[PDB]
Design a binder for this molecule. Structure first.
Ligand code: F9N
Length: 240
């Protein structure tokens, strides 16, 4: 079945951009080497991939297929290609070009990732968030821990904290809590103090990101409360 696809190139490490021969459809696959995975593990692997095969949602990276080649003892997980790359590169680009992201773009990310989470909760970091060709935002996969919530370090509201951190970093081009060591990082996170996002961003956007970064999980907004915010409009949602 791997022969049904042509590898175009390796995106990163392997994650490869591929083309399906039957119709030219562009995809990616992740090549997993199960050559050392014991018989006991391979069950934990199969169930994991089958639950990854559960989420059909426009803001979640879509799973298409799984391929085994016992030749190289290699499993290929085939999924949607996201042409716009990851948010980390967008943050990098902004930093290097000394240019803050548009509030409209930040609102799109907030809206569509909240909907992804809403779906995940029913059934998080910049390198795991992808853009497609039409501004749409996609959650994938669904060493200093910049986004670790205070309760996790001492819960659906923990995801809200993490979304708060990501949106903050999209606005400020830096995370809300920074430190040279983990113990210092933990100190800062527990104190819950951070600079306002840049002043080009509205008080309203600052307020919701700040609410997501409340020290108390029960004071952070739910996904439903986030989506009720008057900032969030139809054009911020996914569009085919
Ligand atoms: C931190 N950043 C600098 C990352 C490195 C820089 N490349 S990049 O910015 O992601 C980039 C550029 C152009 C297209 C795409 N499209 C894409 N990439 C995936 O995974 C990449 C993989 C992530 C983990 C480690 C290895 C790489 C996809 N997975 C499912 N659909 C995918 N679509 C990505």
């Amino acid at each position: 079945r791997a022969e049904d696809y042509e590898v175009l190139y390796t995106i990163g490490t392997r994650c490869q951009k591929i083309r399906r021969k039957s119709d030219g459809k562009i995809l990616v696959w992740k090549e997993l080497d199960y050559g050392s995975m014991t018989e006991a593990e391979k069950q934990m692997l199969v169930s994991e991939v089958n639950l990854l095969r559960e989420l059909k949602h426009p803001n979640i990276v879509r799973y298409y297929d799984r391929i085994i080649d016992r030749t190289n003892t290699t499993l290929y997980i085939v999924m949607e290609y996201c042409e716009g790359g990851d948010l980390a590169s967008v943050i990098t680009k902004g930093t290097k070009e000394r240019q803050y992201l548009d509030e409209e773009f930040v609102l799109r990310v907030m809206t569509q990732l909240t909907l992804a989470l809403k779906e995940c909760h029913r059934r998080l970091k910049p390198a795991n968030v992808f853009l497609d060709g039409k501004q749409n935002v996609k959650l994938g996969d669904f060493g200093t821990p910049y986004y670790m919530s205070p309760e996790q370090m001492n819960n659906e509201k923990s995801d809200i904290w993490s979304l708060g951190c990501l949106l903050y970093e999209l606005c400020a081009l830096m995370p809300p809590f920074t430190a040279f060591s983990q113990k210092e990082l933990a100190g800062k996170i527990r104190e819950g103090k951070f600079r306002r996002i840049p002043y080009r961003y509205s008080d309203e956007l600052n307020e919701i990101i700040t609410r997501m970064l409340n020290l108390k999980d029960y004071h952070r907004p739910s996904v439903e409360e986030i989506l009720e915010n008057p900032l969030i409009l139809e054009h911020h949602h996914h569009h085919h």
